[PDB]
């Protein structure tokens, strides 16, 4: 209930080319993620990275590339761990692997906040559903398991039948898409969810653009926010260590606005950062480099700023 | 004039403090840095502003400094880490850069052989050509440290004596020289003369005589 | 990385230059040392440059005597000595110098040799080690030789196994000498021809001597 | 009095790890800063760069790391060149090293021009009183010696007796804040100083700042201006060879922008260009690009333009 604030690392994916994502955690801990938040007054509570082993062999082969089963279980792991965090009064960080995770912490969180919204900020619209995209795909399909609309065209997975959709297509907000495929598009437009692409920003300004989001999210009524926040929404130069680079994206400026926006509502309860993989950088400084962004984003969130905050009554 | 003392031992696994005394001008007004002189190479730093290590350097090193000293500790001892370390530091009464004289530390990792030693007389064609040398060689010893004293008959002789530093062997155990100049008729006056080799504290002596053989 | 050179041998009054080429691009922005080791005491430093050579320090122990100079243009420094000592005789090492709470050397070079002796070029007077544990050790004393090195084998190299040829003393006076030893077996001495082949190529020198002074 | 130009080296540094940023005024001399300012129709006079020797001990230790009373002597001879460069009709540009030279042009400048206001373009306020930061800190602290209500909290340090606060709170504009301590933060705020941080910038834009700008500095009285332009506002993408580098600065578009204003109101008087600093640098290129930049900005402000300029009446 978003008094004080809880870290929780999911570091799941499915393997294949895009598996150093697990190690995203790691990345973000190590770009002294917990000091920026202690020393941005926050009183916070590290529950640790979730054991993610596959279902039903833990052999290696499965271990490298991971079946759907594993993931949809590890998220309803994951709904639990963010819910009790929840009931207890903390804001949840979830640091990430691929943006799948996105269905376990959504989950959790509707379950004791049911008037929630969502801001997805990603390149992506990661809203494919099971029959539209590839095995593969499960980080760029979430969304489909979550908003209630889509339930007519969404089969039963296993490891995917404890998933009860917590959202109407009314009640999230996209920032950032430049790279959305045919099926995700129709989606878009025929169950009328409202977006704002790249070029919906060159035009309208992230200022205009946070402003008509607030509007079509808490503009009648307060809600408890749930920021679930892709780090490939970031131009790939200032984030190059993710799986699926897609060029014109949000400038350092423009993300941390977004950040900046969020906390000042005061109404965030759970954010998720996902896509940082490491193994994917040119070097070390872009492994780096990618995970002090992704530290900066929380930190706003949070209540970082870029001229000042705190307390002084200064001495001579 | 900053005083580090000489020399240290340890087997790999262990830990050392090595300790750089100095004064107000220096140690007790300015920073301190750590030099490790690998034999044979340049020195490379370790640790500047007392404390602050360099990349790749881990985290077995340790400085520390207090008024007028500082203490490099090392930890985990191992081989590859035996070698020379200075001190240094600025003096504001002088002005310059001082460091210590440096210590060696060796790392024993391998057994206390003691020297094999042979001795050998003056050859006709040097005393035929008026002069004498007596010829000590020292091999196979471990650790790489030595002392010599030459005896003729009772007498101990520092005269025309020239000792080489010990040196390392093919096995990584060590080898050192040492030559006493006589004039003939000292050689042909005295009953014997012996090279008096001391390896951590224990002596091997050998001895020749004029008498052919 | 720095890379110093131009050190040798130099008679003592005598004068020699070296140069130290650094790597980085930011050599010319940063203050660079030379420290000097006199052979096995400790280190030295010498002199110190500033980026652009407005400003040289020197120690007392080579004032005067030496100038510290750099060529940013050719990403070089300089070391000009003058009426050089015995003294003197050290591996000479650059390095750059920054600073933070205090001020460290983190940069440094290989080295290069200075040698300043008043010793002239020469061979050496060779001398057999006759023999007098059931093997025998037999050799040669290759005495006053000016400078390094004597290059020394036994029957050409054919005599391989059991030779043992010291590290040589720098005697007093600047000349140097070494002993050659091999070992072998006591039924062997009269039938096979033991003999020490040296080389002093500085002198185009070479003595073969053989020893049989065994005298039993 | 700004009819011709003067061009002025003022290599000042405290040493310790910022000490290449003495280096500053050749690197961008060696930009073809003259050339530039030649070929731009202007009359120059070039009074080289100043002598900076340690007070009272100039040995070795002392130039590698320098004392406060150094700097604060070493600014009372600049105030004084920069004076008689005034006295004598000539626009000041002084090359920096580190932001503190600022004490000695603004408090030259002031002498001569008594109604002058400030444009302070940095990520940093360098306003800091010599009791809120350390003893290194005196270019992220020159502001509190100039100000003219700062004089109750800031103590007499030797070699800074002879300063005499030649500025009031709202004559001083900030462009480009992104790194503000809370003693700094608290001071904007308590005296009421004006400032565009990154953020106003984001929802403001370029062109409203410099408008609303110019409204708070010259705009109900004509004013000469001293343009202190600090290199680290600039991303440091644009600008990597300098010892603060702050993410999410001015683009390259922003920063000429704001040279152009200053260049179109026709009152430039003074301009400082610091914290260029070579030794910083990933490479030559990275520290020439640096300078390459800071030769645009000054050439901005003294005429340059992206779309011409000039005379012609061309031939057939
Ligand atoms: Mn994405
Ligand atoms: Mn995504
Ligand atoms: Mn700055
Ligand atoms: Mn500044």
């Known amino acids: 209930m978003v008094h004080s604030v809880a870290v929780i690392g999911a570091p799941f994916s499915q393997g294949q080319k895009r598996k150093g994502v697990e190690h995203g955690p790691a990345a973000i801990r190590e770009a002294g993620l917990m000091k920026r938040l202690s020393s941005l007054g926050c009183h916070l509570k590290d529950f640790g990275d979730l054991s993610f082993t596959p279902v039903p062999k833990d052999d290696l082969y499965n271990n490298l590339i991971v079946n759907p089963r594993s993931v949809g279980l590890a998220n309803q792991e994951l709904a639990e761990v963010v819910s009790r965090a929840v009931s207890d009064g903390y804001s949840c960080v979830t640091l990430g692997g691929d943006h799948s995770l996105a269905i376990g912490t959504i989950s959790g969180h509707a379950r004791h906040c049911p008037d929630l919204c969502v801001v997805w900020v990603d390149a992506h619209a990661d809203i494919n559903t099971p029959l539209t995209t590839s095995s593969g795909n499960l980080h760029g399909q979430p969304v489909s398991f979550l908003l209630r609309e889509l339930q007519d065209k969404v089969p039963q997975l296993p490891g995917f039948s404890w998933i009860k959709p917590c959202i109407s297509s009314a009640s999230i907000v996209y920032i950032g898409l430049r790279d959305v495929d045919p099926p995700e598009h129709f989606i878009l437009k025929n169950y009328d969810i409202q977006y704002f692409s790249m070029r919906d920003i060159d035009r309208l300004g992230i200022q205009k653009v946070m402003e008509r989001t607030f509007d079509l999210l808490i503009g009648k009524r307060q809600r408890p926010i749930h920021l679930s926040f892709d780090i490939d929404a970031f131009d790939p130069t200032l984030a190059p260590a993710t799986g699926t680079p897609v060029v014109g994206g949000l400038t350092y400026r423009e993300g941390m606005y977004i950040a900046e926006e969020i906390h000042n509502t005061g109404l965030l309860s759970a954010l998720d950062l996902v896509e940082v993989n490491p193994q994917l950088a040119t070097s070390e400084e872009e492994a780096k480099t990618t995970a002090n962004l992704a530290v900066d984003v929380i930190a706003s969130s949070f209540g970082q700023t870029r001229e000042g905050g705190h307390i002084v009554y200064d001495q001579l | 004039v900053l005083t580090q003392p000489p020399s240290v031992s340890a087997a790999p696994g262990q830990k050392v403090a090595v300790s750089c005394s100095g004064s107000?001008?220096?140690?007790?007004?300015?920073?301190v840095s750590w030099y490790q002189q690998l034999p044979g190479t340049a020195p490379k730093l370790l640790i500047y502003?007392?404390?602050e290590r360099t990349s790749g350097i881990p985290d077995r090193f340790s400085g520390s400094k207090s008024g007028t000293s500082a203490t490099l500790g090392i930890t985990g001892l191992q081989t590859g880490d035996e070698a020379d370390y200075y001190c240094?530091?600025?003096?504001?009464?002088?002005?310059?850069?001082?460091f210590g004289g440096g210590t060696r530390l060796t790392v024993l990792g391998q057994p206390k052989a003691a020297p094999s030693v042979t001795l050998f007389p003056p050859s006709s064609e040097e005393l035929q050509a008026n002069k004498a040398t007596l010829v000590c060689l020292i091999s196979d010893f471990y650790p790489g440290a030595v002392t010599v004293a030459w005896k003729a008959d009772s007498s101990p002789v520092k005269a025309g004596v020239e000792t080489t530093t010990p040196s390392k062997q093919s096995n990584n155990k060590y080898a050192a020289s040492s030559y006493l100049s006589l004039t003939p008729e000292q050689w042909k006056s005295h009953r014997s003369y012996s090279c008096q080799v001391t390896h951590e504290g224990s002596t091997v002596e050998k001895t020749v005589a004029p008498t052919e053989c | 990385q720095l890379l110093e050179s131009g050190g040798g041998l130099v008679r003592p009054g005598g004068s020699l230059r070296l140069s130290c080429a650094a790597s980085?691009?930011?050599?010319?922005?940063?203050?660079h040392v030379w420290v000097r080791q006199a052979p096995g005491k400790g280190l030295e430093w010498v002199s110190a440059?500033?980026?652009?050579?407005?400003?040289?320090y020197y120690a007392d122990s080579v004032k005067s005597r030496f100038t510290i100079s750099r060529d940013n243009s050719k990403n070089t420094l300089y070391l000009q000595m003058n009426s050089l000592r015995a003294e003197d005789t050290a591996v000479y090492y650059c390095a750059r110098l920054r600073a933070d709470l205090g001020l460290y050397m983190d940069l440094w070079g290989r080295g290069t040799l200075v040698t300043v002796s008043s010793a002239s070029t020469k061979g050496p007077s060779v001398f057999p080690l006759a023999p007098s544990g059931g093997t025998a050790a037999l050799g040669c004393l290759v005495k006053d030789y000016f400078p390094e090195p004597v290059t020394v084998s036994w029957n050409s190299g054919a005599l391989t196994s059991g030779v043992h040829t010291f590290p040589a003393v720098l005697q007093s006076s600047g000349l140097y000498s070494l002993s050659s030893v091999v070992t072998v077996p006591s039924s062997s001495l009269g039938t096979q021809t033991y003999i020490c082949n040296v080389n002093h190529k500085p002198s185009n020198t070479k003595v073969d001597k053989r020893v049989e002074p065994k005298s039993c | 009095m700004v009819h011709s130009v003067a061009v002025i080296g003022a290599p000042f540094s405290q040493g310790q790890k910022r000490k290449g940023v003495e280096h500053g005024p050749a690197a961008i001399r060696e930009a073809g800063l003259m050339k530039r300012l030649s070929s731009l129709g202007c009359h120059l006079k070039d009074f080289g760069d100043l002598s900076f020797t340690p007070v009272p001990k100039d040995d070795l230790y002392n130039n590698l790391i320098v004392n406060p009373r150094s700097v604060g002597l070493a600014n009372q001879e600049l105030a004084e060149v920069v004076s008689r460069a005034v006295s004598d009709g000539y626009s000041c540009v002084t090359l920096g090293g580190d932001h503190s030279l600022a004490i000695g042009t603004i408090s030259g400048h002031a002498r001569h021009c008594p109604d002058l206001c400030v444009v302070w373009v940095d990520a940093h306020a360098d306003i800091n009183t010599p009791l809120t930061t350390s003893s290194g800190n005196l270019h992220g602290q020159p502001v509190s010696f100039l100000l003219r209500e700062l004089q109750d909290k800031v103590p007499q340090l030797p070699g800074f007796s002879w300063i005499k606060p030649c500025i009031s709170s709202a004559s001083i504009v900030y462009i480009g804040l992104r790194d503000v301590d809370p003693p700094e933060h608290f001071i904007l705020k308590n005296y009421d100083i004006q400032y565009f941080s990154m953020r106003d910038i984001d929802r403001l834009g370029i062109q409203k700042v410099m408008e609303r700008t110019f409204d708070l500095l010259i705009g109900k009285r004509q004013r000469p201006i001293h343009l202190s332009f600090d290199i680290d506002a600039f991303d440091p993408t644009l600008a990597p060879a300098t010892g603060t580098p702050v993410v999410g600065g001015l683009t390259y578009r922003e920063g000429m922008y704001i040279a152009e204003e200053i260049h179109n109101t026709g009152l430039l008087s003074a301009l400082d260009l610091v914290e260029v600093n070579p030794q910083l640098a990933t490479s030559e290129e990275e520290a020439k690009t640096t300078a390459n930049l800071a030769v645009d900005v000054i050439a901005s402000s003294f005429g340059q333009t992206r779309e011409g300029g000039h005379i012609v009446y061309d031939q057939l």
């Open positions: 440059i500033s980026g652009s050579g407005g400003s040289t």
């Open positions: 240094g530091t600025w003096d504001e009464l002088t002005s310059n850069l001082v």
């Open positions: 107000s001008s220096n140690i007790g007004s300015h920073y």
């Open positions: 980085e691009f930011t050599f010319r922005y940063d203050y």
């Open positions: 502003d007392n404390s």
